[PDB]
Design a protein around this nucleic acid. Structure first.
Ligand SMILES: [Mg+2]
Ligand SMILES: [Mg+2]
Ligand SMILES: [Mg+2]
Ligand SMILES: [Mg+2]
Ligand SMILES: [Mg+2]
Ligand SMILES: [Mg+2]
Ligand SMILES: [Mg+2]
Ligand SMILES: [Mg+2]
Ligand SMILES: [Mg+2]
Ligand SMILES: [Mg+2]
Ligand SMILES: [Mg+2]
Length: 231
RNA sequence: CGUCGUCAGCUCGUGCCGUGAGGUGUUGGGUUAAGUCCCGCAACGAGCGCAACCCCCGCCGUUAGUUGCCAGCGGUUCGG
């Protein structure tokens, strides 16, 4: 499932703005930039995917987090495709560590879908319609990929662990294992199942997250053919 | 009951940070009469306050016509 010229796709990036624990995943540094050893990326993609597989084939949830503008859209696609939750927009504080309270907000979200499907009163004032609807779009913006989470994920997949340090933090306090793609600006030891690759180029964000979702469906019940990628 | 003070404020739940007192939220940019609302945010909500719901005055309509009103008719002791 794994493919090999991801070299055409990413080979990583970032100049000495690096974290030095990431030393082991580096072949050399080129155009004043850290160049990620793909042979290591391989060793890892395997061991990571093995974990991913077992989790799919036991029907266990993955939380997908990415909000850096680059990996932003491709998590709505790729996660819906896996029929799994994600946070696309802002990563609210305490989503895992204070789950039940955050979710108490999704009941509100549902409750608006129900109320605003119609009618059960449109004899409520004009302002209130406006007010309530504005709220509705709101929850929808952050909470959309979140509602699929009815229980604490059995794992979480993150695009930038540095950028999503809070996320990795919340998981570790819960023992929720962490999967992440991570370029050279990252603390490796902080990840359980790790994908040492460029995390800023959508070429790469694409390949890795897709093949992830692919392995997710392929072992879950079915197989599928190409999914959406912006050029 | 006064007062600060009709001032925009004071807290809480759980989360997070801190050995701890405590912090966060309630800070921050814009806006408002206002913790008023907007956006941003390790917070996410909730409460007592703000506001709204009640009374008065301003415009209009309807229900009413006496003890109140008199526009036109008729009388009119000259006082609807
Ligand atoms: Mg980065
Ligand atoms: Mg607290
Ligand atoms: Mg201290
Ligand atoms: Mg503590
Ligand atoms: Mg406290
Ligand atoms: Mg205060
Ligand atoms: Mg305070
Ligand atoms: Mg302010
Ligand atoms: Mg005031
Ligand atoms: Mg308020
Ligand atoms: Mg705030």
């Amino acid at each position: 499932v794994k493919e090999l010229l991801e070299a055409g796709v990413h080979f990583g990036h970032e100049r000495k703005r690096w974290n030095p624990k990431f030393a082991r995943y580096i072949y050399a540094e080129r155009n004043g930039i850290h160049i990620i050893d793909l042979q290591k990326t391989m060793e890892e993609l395997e061991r990571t995917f093995r974990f991913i597989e077992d989790l799919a084939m036991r029907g266990g949830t993955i939380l997908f987090v990415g909000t850096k503008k680059q990996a932003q859209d491709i998590v709505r696609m790729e996660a819906e495709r896996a029929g799994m939750p994600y946070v696309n927009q802002r990563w609210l504080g305490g989503m895992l560590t204070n789950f039940k309270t955050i979710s108490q907000r999704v009941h509100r979200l549902e409750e608006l879908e129900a109320l605003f499907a119609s009618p059960e009163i449109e004899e409520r004032p004009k302002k209130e319609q406006v007010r309530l609807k504005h709220e509705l779009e709101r929850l929808q913006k952050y909470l959309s990929g979140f509602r699929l989470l009815k229980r604490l994920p059995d794992a979480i997949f993150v695009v930038d662990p540095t950028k999503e340090a809070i996320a990795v933090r919340e998981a570790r306090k819960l023992f929720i294992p962490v999967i992440a793609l991570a370029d050279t600006d990252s603390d490796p030891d902080l990840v359980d199942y790790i994908i040492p690759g460029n995390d800023d180029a959508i070429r790469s964000i694409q390949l890795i997250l897709s093949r992830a979702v692919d392995l997710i469906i392929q072992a879950r019940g079915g197989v599928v053919e190409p999914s959406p990628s912006y050029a």
